Amino acid sequence: IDELTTRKCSVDARLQAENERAERQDRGLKEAETTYAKLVESQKTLVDFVRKEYEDTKHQKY
């Protein structure tokens, strides 16, 4: 039963570390996804802008 206490405390100290690391991954995964959405909207702006300049030179061509 005391060997269990050593084992239980070992996994408990690892489980609380697991809780800390998992949340940190959860914290960064959300921030990465929000910054991902920043990149997703990033091209959408210039994609609209690359093809508006793509069309604006058409009049300046002919």
Partner: protein
Amino acid sequence: GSFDEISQYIQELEEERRLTESSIRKMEKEKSDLNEK
């Protein structure tokens, strides 16, 4: 590549989260088994 690789970056970031979730629940039954005996 480009948005595909960052998608894979998030994808593998999610698999690491997924495997972490497996390890979290794994330890719950381990402590439950320890608390059982």
